[PDB]
């Protein structure tokens, strides 16, 4: 089960920033990878590990913290497109793909 | 697969969950294998796993390995693409010289006709329909060598009288590059058909593994000659890029407009079926 | 009859006392029925009467209708006492391949010669000498097909090496506009001759329905490319205004200085009569 | 179009907003062009505009012009109905005498069979048995002239022994009128197909523009013969009106019950497709 996780929280206060750093380090220690800001994902082996991970995430959530958890298949995970104002290549149907000089 | 993935950058490639995994320090990207037709490695700093190579052999994806100069060095050839290969070997050994010389003669006629159509769209006289005249003069066993004369008059008319195929200029380098890529795709198609690639349909004395794929790839050379003629003033890098744009561009088959890979696959299929059925129908490709 | 009545202006037609009454805003003209031979209507604003149509059925005169584009659309077909042109179409169906190849080669030679001569008037000796060499090198069956070897050098000489016919620009649209007007005039002349325009002089391509007129109008094509070369900087509207003055401008025929309509008429008549009589004389037009 | 518009009255016709405009002093009426199939002008006092004629040519609507006697004089024939005509001319020139004589023989067999069906519905056992014997005796090249004998016995049995096809009586006048209308519709269908109407499928020596449309219209003659036989006692005007009621009446095709125009269009389409495909299937029409 592919676990997509979004994380947001007010960062204004210093205690809030410290809590954000602590929660992010906890997410990295648990096996989650950060694709972009507030965007993370982790591959859970089965439903039991997913439930335990949900309980742990609820326990480690900081004050004012908000976490969105969604379950996604590998086919939907490969179809994930990220557009930075340039969009991800995986969503593109282009025939030729260049990792290298685009010339 | 519909997608030609070219890797010019140093990175590590792995195979995970029917997905090609591109891992680098800057970023990581996953591309499904079913969408991938051809895999091209243009540098010597790329790393790969033998498990991903096995998955590529099972997926029947052509893997090309280039040199430090980026020119292609060696490509992977699977031993068994399909079970019909072992049954097709007996038919290839049972082929007749009349069918081989007939199909090869018709293919050479299609190539010369495609040159006359190319320089008829590039619009010349002696070059173009002198080559059409050589096409009407083509005969079995090729005693007059009208194919080599059509090539000499073709390149000499396009690039100038001082030009030659034996020159080391970037024009002939790009010509050999496009002939190497098209020869790799056609050779992979012949591997899909299962027949022996080393056996040619023209000269039984010449022994080369690429002979058959070259005979099948003869009619498509003018497509490379066009972009080579347009980009001849551009640098070899931009010419190689325009040569890579041929995979993205589409061409009009007699039936409908299709991609180059589909035209090569269906053309090779009709050629093999025509060879096994002794010339039922000859596929004709025109620009 | 003899005189061919053509109406290019808004007007009304009536029949009174065996006399055709043509009424236009400027003046009224009455023409005897026995004097008229072929009747053609150029525009869509002409008004006619069914009684005059019946008198024309008794008089056997051919009625030709045209659209706003001036291309002939429909013609009147009587159920009895048919016109001689319908009997003349059978000879067009009987046209030999040798006569068609001779007339086609002569037309291509005239067009290429006009292109080289126009390049000589533009004071390019190398390009005009090359196009003249291709003109002297043209051969039958199109075992040369230099009409493009003169084309590429001619367009590259006129508008520059960067310009081409495939690119989308006001120059190419202007060339297609002039070729559309000349195709309308020559097509109207072929319709006056009665021969079917679907049967072309070129044996290779039957795709176009105007192929006969499109092949006959080739020797007059460079006259459009001259004005398109002079006005090339102007917008497409101004190029259309300049190309619209070709009807008013007078050109030099071999015999005498004449209008373009009479020149195209005599050329078309000589072409048709030469095709039916199997090459008595080939009309030659030089700029 | 589904609608046959007949104008016997003096008036002016214009084209406005894709609408046929009928303007008269008493009243004005507008009829859409898409609903209009055939346009018939039965008088010489009708006025029309060349723009409306061009719109009728683009709409592919048959325009018929009659005389003061109201008999049809001349109909409008468009030069190009569709782009497939120029490609179909080469196929018509490539047709074979075996396919022409075979299709024409089958069509004549369908006509004689329809005459035997008409005499069978008329409860004549000896006449329909004799016509059926001539149908079973029809052969290629028609050496016995069983078609002309079937026509002579048909008209001589229907109208009496003293009757003949060369008579000037209103019976033969109505027969030639219905043959002229059906010949006009079938000729318009042949113009829609694009093939040459002057080339017949029976005798290459006979040269007539209506030959092919007559060969296609041969099986439908008995439909006119029925109404002519029923209304023979009525005046020629009422017989003409009953002949005009044929367009409103429907007939049963082998597939289903359809209108006469649809049966003629689909029948001509199957005939042209059978001629180009060399007798794949022969459409059969029965009363």
CSV table of N, CA and C in Angstrom, one decimal, chain B residues 125-259:
chain,number,residue,atom,x,y,z
B,125,UNK,N,16.5,16.7,-61.9
B,125,UNK,CA,16.3,15.8,-63.1
B,125,UNK,C,17.2,14.6,-63.1
B,126,UNK,N,18.4,14.7,-63.6
B,126,UNK,CA,19.4,13.6,-63.7
B,126,UNK,C,19.4,12.8,-62.4
B,127,UNK,N,19.7,13.5,-61.3
B,127,UNK,CA,19.6,12.8,-60.0
B,127,UNK,C,18.3,12.0,-59.9
B,128,UNK,N,17.2,12.7,-59.9
B,128,UNK,CA,15.9,12.1,-59.5
B,128,UNK,C,15.5,11.0,-60.5
B,129,UNK,N,15.1,11.4,-61.7
B,129,UNK,CA,14.5,10.4,-62.6
B,129,UNK,C,15.6,9.7,-63.5
B,130,UNK,N,16.9,10.1,-63.3
B,130,UNK,CA,17.9,9.2,-63.7
B,130,UNK,C,17.9,8.0,-62.8
B,131,UNK,N,17.7,8.3,-61.5
B,131,UNK,CA,17.6,7.2,-60.6
B,131,UNK,C,16.3,6.4,-60.8
B,132,UNK,N,15.2,7.1,-61.3
B,132,UNK,CA,14.0,6.3,-61.7
B,132,UNK,C,14.3,5.4,-62.9
B,133,UNK,N,15.2,5.9,-63.9
B,133,UNK,CA,15.6,5.1,-65.0
B,133,UNK,C,16.4,3.9,-64.5
B,134,UNK,N,17.4,4.1,-63.6
B,134,UNK,CA,18.1,3.0,-63.0
B,134,UNK,C,17.1,2.0,-62.3
B,135,UNK,N,16.0,2.6,-61.8
B,135,UNK,CA,15.0,1.7,-61.2
B,135,UNK,C,14.3,0.8,-62.2
B,136,UNK,N,13.9,1.4,-63.4
B,136,UNK,CA,13.4,0.6,-64.5
B,136,UNK,C,14.4,-0.3,-65.1
B,137,UNK,N,15.7,-0.1,-64.9
B,137,UNK,CA,16.7,-0.9,-65.4
B,137,UNK,C,17.2,-2.0,-64.5
B,138,UNK,N,16.7,-2.0,-63.2
B,138,UNK,CA,17.1,-3.0,-62.3
B,138,UNK,C,16.7,-4.4,-62.7
B,139,UNK,N,17.7,-5.4,-62.5
B,139,UNK,CA,17.4,-6.7,-62.9
B,139,UNK,C,18.0,-7.7,-61.8
B,140,UNK,N,17.6,-9.0,-62.0
B,140,UNK,CA,18.1,-9.9,-61.0
B,140,UNK,C,19.6,-10.1,-61.0
B,141,UNK,N,20.2,-10.5,-59.9
B,141,UNK,CA,21.6,-10.7,-59.7
B,141,UNK,C,22.4,-9.4,-59.8
B,142,UNK,N,21.7,-8.3,-60.2
B,142,UNK,CA,22.3,-7.0,-60.2
B,142,UNK,C,23.6,-6.9,-61.0
B,143,UNK,N,23.6,-7.3,-62.3
B,143,UNK,CA,24.8,-7.2,-63.1
B,143,UNK,C,25.3,-5.8,-63.4
B,144,UNK,N,24.4,-4.8,-63.5
B,144,UNK,CA,24.7,-3.5,-63.8
B,144,UNK,C,25.1,-2.6,-62.6
B,145,UNK,N,24.8,-3.1,-61.4
B,145,UNK,CA,25.1,-2.4,-60.2
B,145,UNK,C,24.4,-1.0,-60.2
B,146,UNK,N,23.1,-1.0,-60.6
B,146,UNK,CA,22.3,0.2,-60.7
B,146,UNK,C,22.0,0.7,-59.3
B,147,UNK,N,22.1,-0.1,-58.2
B,147,UNK,CA,21.8,0.3,-56.9
B,147,UNK,C,23.0,1.2,-56.4
B,148,UNK,N,24.2,0.7,-56.6
B,148,UNK,CA,25.4,1.5,-56.2
B,148,UNK,C,25.5,2.7,-57.0
B,149,UNK,N,25.2,2.7,-58.3
B,149,UNK,CA,25.2,3.9,-59.2
B,149,UNK,C,24.1,4.8,-58.7
B,150,UNK,N,22.9,4.3,-58.3
B,150,UNK,CA,21.9,5.2,-57.8
B,150,UNK,C,22.3,5.9,-56.5
B,151,UNK,N,23.1,5.2,-55.7
B,151,UNK,CA,23.6,5.7,-54.4
B,151,UNK,C,24.7,6.8,-54.7
B,152,UNK,N,25.6,6.5,-55.6
B,152,UNK,CA,26.6,7.4,-56.0
B,152,UNK,C,26.1,8.7,-56.6
B,153,UNK,N,25.1,8.5,-57.5
B,153,UNK,CA,24.5,9.7,-58.1
B,153,UNK,C,23.6,10.4,-57.1
B,154,UNK,N,23.0,9.7,-56.2
B,154,UNK,CA,22.2,10.3,-55.2
B,154,UNK,C,23.0,11.2,-54.2
B,155,UNK,N,24.0,10.7,-53.6
B,155,UNK,CA,24.8,11.5,-52.7
B,155,UNK,C,25.7,12.5,-53.4
B,156,UNK,N,26.1,12.2,-54.7
B,156,UNK,CA,26.9,13.2,-55.4
B,156,UNK,C,26.0,14.3,-55.9
B,157,UNK,N,24.7,14.1,-56.2
B,157,UNK,CA,23.8,15.1,-56.6
B,157,UNK,C,23.4,15.9,-55.4
B,158,UNK,N,23.1,15.3,-54.2
B,158,UNK,CA,22.7,16.0,-53.0
B,158,UNK,C,23.7,16.9,-52.4
B,159,UNK,N,24.9,16.3,-52.1
B,159,UNK,CA,26.0,16.9,-51.4
B,159,UNK,C,27.0,17.6,-52.3
B,160,UNK,N,26.9,17.4,-53.6
B,160,UNK,CA,27.9,18.0,-54.5
B,160,UNK,C,28.8,16.9,-55.1
B,161,UNK,N,29.4,17.2,-56.2
B,161,UNK,CA,30.2,16.2,-56.9
B,161,UNK,C,31.5,15.9,-56.1
B,162,UNK,N,32.0,16.8,-55.4
B,162,UNK,CA,33.2,16.6,-54.6
B,162,UNK,C,33.0,15.7,-53.4
B,163,UNK,N,31.7,15.5,-53.0
B,163,UNK,CA,31.3,14.7,-51.9
B,163,UNK,C,31.5,13.2,-52.2
B,164,UNK,N,31.7,12.4,-51.2
B,164,UNK,CA,31.9,10.9,-51.4
B,164,UNK,C,31.5,10.2,-50.1
B,165,UNK,N,31.1,8.9,-50.3
B,165,UNK,CA,30.7,8.2,-49.1
B,165,UNK,C,31.9,7.7,-48.3
B,166,UNK,N,33.1,7.7,-48.8
B,166,UNK,CA,34.3,7.3,-48.1
B,166,UNK,C,34.9,8.5,-47.3
B,167,UNK,N,34.3,9.7,-47.3
B,167,UNK,CA,34.9,10.8,-46.6
B,167,UNK,C,34.6,10.6,-45.1
B,168,UNK,N,35.5,11.3,-44.3
B,168,UNK,CA,35.4,11.3,-42.9
B,168,UNK,C,34.5,12.5,-42.3
B,169,UNK,N,33.9,13.2,-43.2
B,169,UNK,CA,33.2,14.4,-42.8
B,169,UNK,C,32.0,14.0,-41.9
B,170,UNK,N,31.5,15.0,-41.1
B,170,UNK,CA,30.4,14.7,-40.2
B,170,UNK,C,29.1,14.4,-41.0
B,171,UNK,N,29.0,14.6,-42.3
B,171,UNK,CA,27.9,14.2,-43.1
B,171,UNK,C,27.8,12.7,-43.2
B,172,UNK,N,29.0,12.0,-43.6
B,172,UNK,CA,29.0,10.6,-43.6
B,172,UNK,C,29.0,10.0,-42.2
B,173,UNK,N,29.5,10.7,-41.2
B,173,UNK,CA,29.4,10.2,-39.8
B,173,UNK,C,27.9,10.2,-39.3
B,174,UNK,N,27.1,11.2,-39.7
B,174,UNK,CA,25.7,11.2,-39.3
B,174,UNK,C,25.0,10.2,-40.2
B,175,UNK,N,25.4,9.9,-41.4
B,175,UNK,CA,24.8,8.9,-42.2
B,175,UNK,C,25.0,7.5,-41.6
B,176,UNK,N,26.2,7.3,-41.2
B,176,UNK,CA,26.5,6.0,-40.6
B,176,UNK,C,25.9,5.9,-39.2
B,177,UNK,N,25.6,7.0,-38.5
B,177,UNK,CA,24.9,7.0,-37.2
B,177,UNK,C,23.5,6.6,-37.4
B,178,UNK,N,22.8,7.3,-38.4
B,178,UNK,CA,21.4,6.9,-38.6
B,178,UNK,C,21.2,5.5,-39.2
B,179,UNK,N,22.2,5.1,-40.0
B,179,UNK,CA,22.2,3.7,-40.5
B,179,UNK,C,22.4,2.7,-39.4
B,180,UNK,N,23.2,3.1,-38.3
B,180,UNK,CA,23.4,2.3,-37.2
B,180,UNK,C,22.2,2.2,-36.3
B,181,UNK,N,21.5,3.3,-36.1
B,181,UNK,CA,20.2,3.3,-35.3
B,181,UNK,C,19.1,2.5,-36.0
B,182,UNK,N,18.9,2.8,-37.3
B,182,UNK,CA,17.9,2.1,-38.1
B,182,UNK,C,18.3,0.6,-38.2
B,183,UNK,N,19.6,0.4,-38.4
B,183,UNK,CA,20.0,-1.0,-38.4
B,183,UNK,C,19.8,-1.7,-37.1
B,184,UNK,N,19.9,-1.0,-36.0
B,184,UNK,CA,19.6,-1.6,-34.7
B,184,UNK,C,18.1,-1.9,-34.5
B,185,UNK,N,17.3,-1.0,-34.9
B,185,UNK,CA,15.8,-1.2,-34.8
B,185,UNK,C,15.4,-2.4,-35.7
B,186,UNK,N,15.9,-2.3,-37.0
B,186,UNK,CA,15.5,-3.4,-37.9
B,186,UNK,C,16.1,-4.7,-37.4
B,187,UNK,N,17.3,-4.7,-36.9
B,187,UNK,CA,17.9,-6.0,-36.4
B,187,UNK,C,17.1,-6.5,-35.2
B,188,UNK,N,16.6,-5.6,-34.3
B,188,UNK,CA,15.7,-6.0,-33.2
B,188,UNK,C,14.4,-6.6,-33.7
B,189,UNK,N,13.9,-6.0,-34.8
B,189,UNK,CA,12.7,-6.6,-35.4
B,189,UNK,C,12.9,-8.0,-36.0
B,190,UNK,N,14.1,-8.2,-36.6
B,190,UNK,CA,14.4,-9.5,-37.1
B,190,UNK,C,14.6,-10.5,-36.0
B,191,UNK,N,15.1,-10.0,-34.8
B,191,UNK,CA,15.2,-10.8,-33.6
B,191,UNK,C,13.8,-11.2,-33.1
B,192,UNK,N,12.8,-10.3,-33.3
B,192,UNK,CA,11.5,-10.6,-32.9
B,192,UNK,C,10.9,-11.6,-33.8
B,193,UNK,N,11.2,-11.5,-35.1
B,193,UNK,CA,10.7,-12.5,-36.1
B,193,UNK,C,11.3,-13.9,-35.8
B,194,UNK,N,12.6,-13.9,-35.3
B,194,UNK,CA,13.2,-15.2,-35.0
B,194,UNK,C,14.2,-15.7,-36.0
B,195,UNK,N,14.1,-15.3,-37.3
B,195,UNK,CA,15.0,-15.8,-38.3
B,195,UNK,C,16.4,-15.3,-38.1
B,196,UNK,N,17.3,-16.0,-38.7
B,196,UNK,CA,18.7,-15.7,-38.5
B,196,UNK,C,19.1,-14.4,-39.2
B,197,UNK,N,19.7,-13.5,-38.5
B,197,UNK,CA,20.0,-12.2,-39.0
B,197,UNK,C,21.3,-12.2,-39.9
B,198,UNK,N,22.1,-13.2,-39.7
B,198,UNK,CA,23.4,-13.3,-40.5
B,198,UNK,C,23.2,-13.7,-41.9
B,199,UNK,N,22.0,-14.3,-42.2
B,199,UNK,CA,21.8,-14.8,-43.6
B,199,UNK,C,21.1,-13.7,-44.4
B,200,UNK,N,21.8,-13.3,-45.4
B,200,UNK,CA,21.2,-12.2,-46.3
B,200,UNK,C,20.4,-12.8,-47.5
B,201,UNK,N,19.6,-11.9,-48.0
B,201,UNK,CA,18.8,-12.2,-49.2
B,201,UNK,C,19.4,-11.9,-50.5
B,202,UNK,N,20.6,-11.3,-50.5
B,202,UNK,CA,21.2,-10.8,-51.8
B,202,UNK,C,22.4,-11.7,-52.1
B,203,UNK,N,23.5,-11.6,-51.4
B,203,UNK,CA,24.7,-12.3,-51.6
B,203,UNK,C,25.0,-13.3,-50.5
B,204,UNK,N,25.1,-14.6,-50.9
B,204,UNK,CA,25.4,-15.6,-50.0
B,204,UNK,C,26.9,-15.7,-49.6
B,205,UNK,N,27.7,-15.0,-50.4
B,205,UNK,CA,29.1,-15.0,-50.1
B,205,UNK,C,29.5,-14.1,-49.0
B,206,UNK,N,28.8,-12.9,-49.0
B,206,UNK,CA,29.1,-11.9,-47.9
B,206,UNK,C,28.5,-12.5,-46.6
B,207,UNK,N,29.3,-12.5,-45.5
B,207,UNK,CA,28.9,-13.0,-44.2
B,207,UNK,C,28.9,-11.9,-43.2
B,208,UNK,N,27.7,-11.4,-42.8
B,208,UNK,CA,27.6,-10.3,-41.8
B,208,UNK,C,26.3,-10.5,-41.0
B,209,UNK,N,26.4,-10.2,-39.8
B,209,UNK,CA,25.2,-10.4,-38.9
B,209,UNK,C,24.1,-9.3,-39.2
B,210,UNK,N,24.5,-8.2,-39.8
B,210,UNK,CA,23.6,-7.1,-40.1
B,210,UNK,C,23.1,-7.1,-41.5
B,211,UNK,N,23.5,-8.1,-42.3
B,211,UNK,CA,23.2,-8.1,-43.7
B,211,UNK,C,21.7,-8.1,-44.0
B,212,UNK,N,21.0,-9.0,-43.3
B,212,UNK,CA,19.5,-9.1,-43.5
B,212,UNK,C,18.8,-7.8,-43.0
B,213,UNK,N,19.2,-7.4,-41.9
B,213,UNK,CA,18.6,-6.1,-41.4
B,213,UNK,C,18.9,-4.9,-42.2
B,214,UNK,N,20.1,-5.0,-42.9
B,214,UNK,CA,20.4,-3.9,-43.8
B,214,UNK,C,19.5,-4.0,-45.1
B,215,UNK,N,19.3,-5.2,-45.6
B,215,UNK,CA,18.5,-5.4,-46.8
B,215,UNK,C,17.0,-5.0,-46.5
B,216,UNK,N,16.6,-5.2,-45.2
B,216,UNK,CA,15.2,-4.8,-44.9
B,216,UNK,C,15.2,-3.2,-44.6
B,217,UNK,N,16.3,-2.7,-44.2
B,217,UNK,CA,16.4,-1.2,-43.9
B,217,UNK,C,16.8,-0.4,-45.1
B,218,UNK,N,17.0,-1.0,-46.3
B,218,UNK,CA,17.4,-0.2,-47.4
B,218,UNK,C,16.4,0.8,-47.9
B,219,UNK,N,15.1,0.5,-47.9
B,219,UNK,CA,14.2,1.5,-48.4
B,219,UNK,C,14.0,2.8,-47.5
B,220,UNK,N,14.4,2.7,-46.2
B,220,UNK,CA,14.2,3.8,-45.3
B,220,UNK,C,15.4,4.8,-45.2
B,221,UNK,N,16.4,4.5,-46.0
B,221,UNK,CA,17.6,5.4,-45.9
B,221,UNK,C,17.3,6.8,-46.3
B,222,UNK,N,16.5,7.0,-47.3
B,222,UNK,CA,16.2,8.4,-47.8
B,222,UNK,C,15.6,9.3,-46.7
B,223,UNK,N,14.9,8.7,-45.8
B,223,UNK,CA,14.3,9.4,-44.7
B,223,UNK,C,15.4,10.1,-43.8
B,224,UNK,N,16.5,9.3,-43.6
B,224,UNK,CA,17.7,9.9,-42.9
B,224,UNK,C,18.4,10.9,-43.8
B,225,UNK,N,18.5,10.6,-45.1
B,225,UNK,CA,19.1,11.5,-46.1
B,225,UNK,C,18.5,12.9,-46.1
B,226,UNK,N,17.1,12.9,-45.9
B,226,UNK,CA,16.4,14.2,-45.9
B,226,UNK,C,16.9,15.1,-44.8
B,227,UNK,N,16.8,14.6,-43.5
B,227,UNK,CA,17.2,15.4,-42.4
B,227,UNK,C,18.7,15.7,-42.4
B,228,UNK,N,19.5,14.7,-42.9
B,228,UNK,CA,20.9,15.0,-43.0
B,228,UNK,C,21.1,16.1,-44.1
B,229,UNK,N,20.3,16.2,-45.1
B,229,UNK,CA,20.5,17.2,-46.1
B,229,UNK,C,20.0,18.6,-45.6
B,230,UNK,N,19.0,18.6,-44.7
B,230,UNK,CA,18.5,19.9,-44.2
B,230,UNK,C,19.4,20.4,-43.1
B,231,UNK,N,19.9,19.5,-42.2
B,231,UNK,CA,20.7,19.9,-41.1
B,231,UNK,C,22.2,19.9,-41.4
B,232,UNK,N,22.6,19.6,-42.6
B,232,UNK,CA,24.0,19.5,-43.0
B,232,UNK,C,24.9,20.7,-42.5
B,233,UNK,N,24.3,21.9,-42.5
B,233,UNK,CA,25.0,23.1,-42.1
B,233,UNK,C,25.1,23.1,-40.6
B,234,UNK,N,24.2,22.5,-39.8
B,234,UNK,CA,24.2,22.5,-38.4
B,234,UNK,C,25.3,21.6,-37.9
B,235,UNK,N,25.7,21.8,-36.6
B,235,UNK,CA,26.7,21.0,-36.0
B,235,UNK,C,26.2,19.6,-35.8
B,236,UNK,N,27.2,18.7,-35.6
B,236,UNK,CA,26.9,17.3,-35.5
B,236,UNK,C,26.0,16.9,-34.3
B,237,UNK,N,26.0,17.8,-33.3
B,237,UNK,CA,25.2,17.5,-32.1
B,237,UNK,C,23.7,17.8,-32.5
B,238,UNK,N,23.5,19.0,-33.1
B,238,UNK,CA,22.1,19.3,-33.5
B,238,UNK,C,21.6,18.3,-34.6
B,239,UNK,N,22.5,17.8,-35.5
B,239,UNK,CA,22.2,16.8,-36.5
B,239,UNK,C,21.8,15.5,-35.8
B,240,UNK,N,22.5,15.2,-34.7
B,240,UNK,CA,22.1,14.0,-34.0
B,240,UNK,C,20.7,14.2,-33.3
B,241,UNK,N,20.5,15.4,-32.8
B,241,UNK,CA,19.2,15.6,-32.2
B,241,UNK,C,18.1,15.5,-33.2
B,242,UNK,N,18.2,16.1,-34.4
B,242,UNK,CA,17.2,16.0,-35.5
B,242,UNK,C,17.1,14.6,-35.9
B,243,UNK,N,18.2,13.8,-35.8
B,243,UNK,CA,18.0,12.3,-36.1
B,243,UNK,C,17.2,11.6,-35.0
B,244,UNK,N,17.3,12.1,-33.8
B,244,UNK,CA,16.5,11.6,-32.7
B,244,UNK,C,15.0,12.0,-32.8
B,245,UNK,N,14.8,13.1,-33.5
B,245,UNK,CA,13.4,13.6,-33.7
B,245,UNK,C,12.6,12.7,-34.7
B,246,UNK,N,13.3,11.8,-35.4
B,246,UNK,CA,12.7,10.9,-36.4
B,246,UNK,C,11.7,9.9,-35.6
B,247,UNK,N,12.1,9.5,-34.4
B,247,UNK,CA,11.3,8.6,-33.6
B,247,UNK,C,10.0,9.3,-33.2
B,248,UNK,N,10.1,10.6,-32.9
B,248,UNK,CA,8.9,11.4,-32.6
B,248,UNK,C,8.0,11.6,-33.8
B,249,UNK,N,8.6,11.9,-34.9
B,249,UNK,CA,7.8,12.2,-36.1
B,249,UNK,C,7.1,10.9,-36.6
B,250,UNK,N,6.0,11.1,-37.4
B,250,UNK,CA,5.2,10.0,-37.9
B,250,UNK,C,5.3,10.1,-39.5
B,251,UNK,N,5.2,8.9,-40.1
B,251,UNK,CA,5.3,8.8,-41.5
B,251,UNK,C,4.0,8.1,-42.0
B,252,UNK,N,3.7,8.3,-43.3
B,252,UNK,CA,2.5,7.8,-43.9
B,252,UNK,C,2.7,6.5,-44.6
B,253,UNK,N,2.2,5.4,-44.0
B,253,UNK,CA,2.2,4.1,-44.6
B,253,UNK,C,1.1,4.1,-45.6
B,254,UNK,N,1.2,3.1,-46.6
B,254,UNK,CA,0.1,2.9,-47.6
B,254,UNK,C,-1.3,2.8,-47.0
B,255,UNK,N,-1.4,2.1,-45.8
B,255,UNK,CA,-2.6,2.0,-45.1
B,255,UNK,C,-3.1,3.2,-44.4
B,256,UNK,N,-2.2,3.8,-43.6
B,256,UNK,CA,-2.5,5.0,-42.9
B,256,UNK,C,-1.2,5.6,-42.4
B,257,UNK,N,-1.3,6.7,-41.6
B,257,UNK,CA,-0.2,7.3,-41.0
B,257,UNK,C,0.2,6.7,-39.7
B,258,UNK,N,1.4,6.2,-39.6
B,258,UNK,CA,1.9,5.4,-38.4
B,258,UNK,C,3.2,5.9,-38.0
B,259,UNK,N,3.6,5.4,-36.8
B,259,UNK,CA,5.0,5.7,-36.3
B,259,UNK,C,6.0,4.8,-37.0
